[PDB]
């Protein structure tokens, strides 16, 4: 007749105890189960639902869209407690990943253990990026994972950082306290953010003062949120900041909140960023009870959550599906109310904007463009890692000035900004400045400052195939063009030669008829290859 609520309901009320049971608060429960038990089993879902008084369809829809929650029924086989993962994106794959997978999947892939695939975790800098149960590795290899497993090194490992007191030693939350006091009004902040031209980060290229003014003009109880997903492959900035000085980001966030008069806020970062998930939970409790309460949430896979509307639906405890653009996110948001999103980076800089001004944000640009940005170089360079440098900078100067060079043994053939969403270009496209509104007349763009460098020893078509696989596995699943076009491309790009004409048609279609901003870009790489690589056909 139906799945019945079993006697196994004791372990669901003896484990949640005194917690709230609102639909918007679901994912935390699922994470809790997947932590205390290495799996999520039906009986537990039935009990949880009949507690929250829901239907099995909803919890089943949600518990499988996020790529980490592992489900089983009374029939399937038990899952092991100890698992590991490997990167399969472009960077981690250029340094010999797949061989690693099929090389250790037959030495230590036994019952007690497991080994599976993973798109990207934010470690494109230290090549392989393997993890062992909330612990990550670098320059990974077999003889290292052996020791990491034989010893119960599943648990993480925490570095040192700057605490509340050491931050308070300097400016230390004095710029903020100047707001709860009338020692400086609001309008000045809007004015500096405007005349200084802080074109926001994230793959949008949008100002900030306008957003703040807007979300300030609409009435009612306001909200806010932050996207700390940064799931795009060649993007490993947020980690290098949340792990060195977060209190600056919290300063910026509280500032951006009190201005819009948002009672509470929200946050959202991956499950693949645990270290920060502990840094914060250590720090917040030290942040006094000022009057603005903050929160913190998790996120399981779902690169489609990098998007705004999907992040909203997730914070609402729902399935990670985006919404239509004619009704806007700043008008109707987290709970059908206004809310302003801002990446942690855009917040990290505000303090230096105010304490110093705008001119300090205009004497920097090198080429005609103006600004200051934090790039993320990766691939075959000599001193990879994050980089700060004046925007409007070419790529050759970014290689032979900041990154040390390229390598001793390789050469320079191709490269790609904007990570996967962007295209892959050749050398000759070397005298082009890297800013927001400069590359749209070439097919690609730069949204996340992601940069990569491929040599002659590397092949491009395989890279495009990997990118298409990624876009095929990260697709939400609503709009037809993505859902089926990604498949047809992962297929057409398989054979020895593809037509490129069916592909041009399919790309035009996907770019003109896609709901989300992902399908609008999953065809950029192949098209750029067709155009600027006319010697590969």
């Amino acid at each position: 007749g139906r799945q019945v609520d079993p006697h196994a309901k004791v372990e669901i009320e003896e484990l949640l105890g005194t917690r709230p049971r609102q639909r918007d608060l679901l994912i935390e429960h699922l994470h809790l189960i997947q932590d205390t038990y290495g799996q999520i089993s039906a009986d537990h879902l039935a009990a949880l639902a009949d507690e929250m008084s829901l239907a099995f369809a909803e919890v089943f829809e949600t518990a499988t869209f996020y790529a980490h929650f592992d489900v089983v029924k009374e029939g399937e086989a038990d899952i092991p407690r100890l698992t590991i993962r490997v990167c399969d994106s472009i960077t981690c794959a250029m340094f010999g990943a797949d061989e690693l997978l099929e090389t250790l999947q037959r030495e230590l892939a036994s019952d007690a253990v497991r080994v599976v695939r993973a798109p990207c975790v934010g470690l494109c800098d230290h090549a392989p990026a393997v993890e062992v149960g909330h612990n990550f590795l670098h320059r990974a290899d077999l003889a290292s994972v052996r020791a990491a497993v034989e010893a119960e090194d599943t648990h993480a490992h925490i570095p040192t950082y700057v605490d509340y007191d050491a931050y308070r030693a300097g400016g230390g939350y004095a710029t903020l306290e100047r707001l709860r006091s009338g020692e400086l009004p609001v309008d000045d902040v809007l004015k500096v953010l405007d005349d200084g031209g802080l074109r926001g980060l994230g793959g949008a290229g949008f100002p900030t003062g306008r957003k703040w003014r807007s979300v300030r003009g609409e009435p009612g109880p306001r909200l806010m949120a932050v996207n700390g997903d940064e799931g795009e492959p060649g993007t490993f900035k947020d980690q290098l900041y949340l792990n060195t000085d977060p209190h600056r980001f919290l300063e910026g966030m509280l500032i951006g909140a009190h201005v819009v008069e948002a009672a509470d806020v929200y946050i959202y970062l991956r499950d693949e960023y645990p270290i920060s998930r502990e840094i914060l939970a250590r720090e917040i409790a030290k942040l006094p009870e000022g009057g603005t309460r903050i929160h913190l949430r998790r996120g399981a896979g779902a690169y489609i959550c990098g998007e705004e509307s999907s992040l909203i639906e997730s914070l609402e405890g729902k399935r990670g599906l985006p919404r239509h653009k004619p009704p806007f996110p700043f008008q109707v948001g987290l709970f059908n109310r206004p809310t302003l999103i801002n990446n942690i980076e855009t917040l990290f800089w505000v303090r230096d904007l105010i304490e110093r001004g705008a001119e300090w944000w205009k004497s920097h640009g090198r080429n005609g463009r103006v600004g200051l940005r934090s790039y993320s170089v990766s691939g075959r360079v000599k001193e990879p890692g994050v980089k700060l440098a004046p925007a409007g900078l070419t790529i050759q100067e970014l290689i032979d000035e900041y990154c040390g060079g390229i390598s001793d043994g390789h050469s320079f053939a191709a490269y790609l900004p904007g990570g996967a969403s962007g295209g892959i270009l050749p050398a000759s496209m070397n005298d082009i400045p890297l800013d927001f509104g400069t590359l749209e007349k070439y097919g690609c763009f730069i949204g996340s400052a992601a940069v990569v460098i491929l040599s002659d020893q590397d092949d491009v078509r395989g890279a495009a195939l990997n990118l298409m696989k990624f876009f095929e596995d990260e697709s939400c699943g609503q709009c037809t063009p993505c859902r089926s076009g990604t498949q047809k491309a992962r297929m057409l790009m398989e054979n020895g030669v593809w037509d490129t004409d069916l592909l041009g048609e399919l790309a035009q279609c996907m770019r003109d008829a896609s709901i989300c901003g992902l399908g609008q870009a999953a065809s950029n790489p192949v098209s750029t290859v067709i155009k600027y690589f006319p010697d590969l056909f």
Partner: protein
């Protein structure tokens, strides 16, 4: 609103998404994922209805947008056509061969043939398998276009919370509870997702075979209604020559394109093989005293009844009745008695259940009709319910309520000992030991007046007795009855505040309350919640119990009662017996009849002789054993006009071939004050016939000489007396289909709310009744 289109400067009304404007204008374009039928909602997934507009850089959709001022749409262009064609190419690439597949003549293939596509140039996907666990349906799901209509039908309208898409893009599928085969899933066979999937994936049986593929087209079609509930769910029966198959819903103002298991399946009784076609007067197949004939076994009825009348008298006769499957027959099934037998000894074994209700309703208001409909609970703000289970026996209304909860958030309440499905959607749940509702009912009754939060004005000139009761009332209290009922007080304070403060409200219940001896005493108090607060006789307000048959209203409102002729004009009166006779030309009996159980226990060692049974299985309905076997045993001359040889009338000395439901015209009514027309589909087997001919022939054989003709004149001869239909005709009961009777004007929709400006009672006011705890 003015906005250009395809080179024009046309106008559009509001809420008119571009698609509808084109349709209205005659520029049809494909949707595939947008079901225009009222009830649904667009989602914008297929992206096959795309157009262009000056100002944007990415193509748009036509089902989800709206033509604001200045805008200009474009369809006859290149980009849009290319996009549509590419989408269709992908879909048909992941599709089987339309030559021989599930539903080859479908919506998808039509919209494809529109965009001029036959095959594709992309490869396949090696999709999943099928499951046929459930008998009626057949999920050979290899044609899922991810149109999400299954869901909007099972997660937004016929709410049962079963279906859901529970995977990622490529592997995205539709699954029932926990990826179960749906043969033991929560599916209730509510066929609202079977007629929404355009492809033949989510397809019923009887339209395909083992090598699953269509095998049949619609032989013909007929629009009718369901003879199982009292809602009037319209249907369009699918027929094959001497075979009925399966149906779909229609835009009926009572159903709105949504049915239950029985609107889809379960009608194997009509064409059921073991049946009756001739007189037959124990195993099922007749084996005794069978003599096929039509003038012998009618002499043996007319002459028998007439002679036993002569030798024993009129009152020595009696008669049961029925309303399961017709209305106009009752008018005659009672006129026949009143004329040939000259006796008001009629009865009604179906009206038994909900008598107390109408008793109180006519005591207080001079009526017995549920105040206002149930399909109007979407403009209200609150609900009340006790002693029922709509989802089971009146589902359609239950899902209407669920939808009102979802959309407008209007809360509800519950009053039932056991736990009910709607609990999940219920704002509260109030269990109590039985036969004690009246206690908390008085509590809610006196919580208002004692605190002082009543609407004096409405009680000022629209309900009398408001002061004579207050002795017991202020003597009563809403705080004392805890151990008597089983609840706490603050809950009740709340509930009463909710109702009386609520802008509007309604109350539902059924036989669960009126089943008890003094269920009258229950309604005796429940009556006045809307009356004492005013939330009545106005949009979204009213009182509305429910009934468990088709047209019990239509029967017990047109003169099948032992104490009143049609339209509630009692017999004990005088002028009633003086104006009816200008039509029937007879001398009647003023003294009432012997009620159902009264007459039954009477004949037991009594004086009545025989009867003319019809449309009932009395041997197993009210009485357990004593008045089933010994009831008719001592009887001398018996009659039974039942479709089958039901357990009752095993020794009924004569029989006639009752026609089944699906073969007739006429008039039916629901528990909603509405009258529904019908229409025949298939003639019956054997020399069987209808009943409006049986009774005509028998009246003739009993010296009545009616010769009226067909039902299309019985309607007029029944309305000429009953003013309830003072402005009605069969013509507009066919065209426009169904209507409700309380209307006044000819060319108007209707008048569909009791007491909009005053009770239709002599005083214009009610008589609020003393309600006591009287065990």
């Amino acid at each position: 609103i003015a906005f250009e289109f395809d080179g024009q400067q046309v106008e559009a009304q509001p809420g008119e998404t571009i698609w509808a404007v084109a349709k209205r204008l005659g520029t049809h374009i494909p949707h595939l994922c947008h079901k225009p039928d009222p009830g649904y909602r667009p989602d914008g997934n297929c992206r096959a209805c795309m157009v262009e507009i000056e100002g944007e850089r990415v193509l748009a959709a036509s089902c989800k947008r709206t033509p604001a001022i200045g805008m200009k749409v474009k369809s006859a262009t290149e980009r849009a056509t290319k996009a549509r064609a590419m989408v269709l190419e992908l879909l048909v690439a992941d599709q089987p061969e339309r030559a021989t597949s599930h539903d080859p003549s479908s919506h998808f293939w039509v919209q494809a043939d529109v965009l001029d596509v036959t095959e594709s140039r992309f490869p396949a996907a090696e999709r999943w398998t099928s499951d046929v666990s459930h008998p009626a349906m057949s999920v050979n799901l290899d044609a899922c276009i991810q149109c999400n209509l299954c869901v909007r039908a099972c997660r937004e309208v016929q709410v049962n919370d079963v279906i859901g898409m529970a995977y990622r893009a490529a592997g995205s599928k539709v699954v029932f509870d926990f990826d179960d085969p749906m043969g033991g899933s929560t599916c209730v066979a509510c066929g609202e997702c079977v007629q929404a999937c355009p492809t033949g994936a989510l397809m019923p049986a009887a339209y395909l075979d083992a090598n699953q593929t269509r095998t049949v087209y619609p032989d013909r079609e007929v629009k009718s209604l369901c003879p199982y509930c009292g809602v009037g769910c319209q249907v369009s029966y699918k027929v094959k020559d001497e075979r009925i198959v399966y149906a779909e819903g229609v835009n009926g103002p009572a159903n709105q394109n949504r049915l239950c298991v029985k609107g889809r399946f379960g009608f194997d009784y009509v064409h059921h093989p073991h049946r009756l076609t001739v007189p037959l007067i124990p195993a099922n197949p007749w084996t005794h005293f069978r003599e096929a004939t039509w003038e012998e076994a009618l002499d043996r009825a007319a002459g028998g009844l007439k002679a036993i009348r002569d030798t024993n008298g009129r009152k020595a006769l009696a008669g049961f009745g029925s309303a399961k499957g017709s209305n106009e027959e009752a008018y005659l099934f009672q006129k026949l008695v009143r004329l040939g037998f000259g006796t008001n000894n009629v009865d009604h074994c179906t009206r038994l259940c909900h008598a107390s209700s109408v008793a109180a309703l006519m005591e207080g208001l001079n009526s017995g009709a549920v105040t206002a409909p149930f399909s109007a609970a979407l403009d209200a703000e609150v609900i009340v319910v006790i002693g029922a289970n709509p989802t089971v026996n009146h589902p359609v209304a239950a899902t209407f309520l669920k939808n009102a909860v979802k959309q407008r958030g209007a809360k509800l309440i519950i009053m039932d000992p056991r736990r009910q499905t709607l609990s999940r959607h219920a704002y509260r749940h109030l269990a109590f030991r039985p036969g004690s509702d009246v206690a908390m009912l008085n509590a809610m009754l006196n919580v208002i007046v004692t605190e002082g939060l009543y609407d004096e004005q409405y009680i000022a000139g629209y309900t009398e007795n408001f002061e004579a009761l207050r002795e017991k009332i202020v003597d009563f209290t809403p705080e004392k009855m805890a151990s008597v009922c089983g609840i706490d007080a603050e809950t009740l304070r709340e509930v009463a505040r909710l109702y009386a403060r609520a802008k509007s409200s309604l109350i539902f219940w059924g036989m669960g309350v009126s089943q008890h001896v003094h269920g009258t005493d229950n309604s005796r108090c429940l009556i006045a919640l809307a009356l004492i607060t005013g939330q009545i006789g106005r949009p979204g307000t009213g009182l509305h119990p429910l009934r468990g048959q088709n047209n019990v209203q239509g029967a017990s409102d047109a003169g099948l009662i032992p104490m009143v002729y049609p339209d509630y004009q009692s017999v004990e009166k005088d002028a009633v017996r003086e104006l009816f006779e200008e039509f029937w030309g007879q001398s009647l009996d003023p003294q009432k009849g012997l009620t159902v159980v009264e007459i039954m226990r009477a004949i037991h060692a009594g004086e009545i002789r025989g009867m003319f049974v019809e449309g009932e299985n009395p041997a197993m309905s009210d009485p357990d054993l004593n008045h089933a076997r010994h009831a008719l045993a001592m009887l001398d001359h018996l009659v039974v006009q039942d479709l089958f040889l039901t357990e009752t009338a095993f020794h009924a000395d004569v029989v006639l071939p009752a026609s089944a439901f699906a073969e007739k015209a006429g008039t039916f009514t629901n528990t909603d004050r509405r009258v529904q027309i019908a229409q025949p589909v298939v003639a019956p087997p054997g020399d069987a016939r209808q009943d409006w001919w049986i009774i005509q022939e028998l009246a003739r054989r009993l010296d009545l000489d009616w010769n009226y003709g067909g039902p299309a004149d019985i309607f007029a001869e029944m309305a000429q007396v009953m003013p309830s239909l003072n402005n009605i005709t069969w013509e507009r009961l066919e065209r426009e289909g169904a209507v409700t009777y309380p209307v006044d004007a000819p060319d108007q929709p209707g008048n569909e709310i009791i007491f909009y400006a005053g009770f239709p009672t002599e005083s214009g006011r009610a008589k609020i009744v003393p309600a006591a705890i009287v065990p």
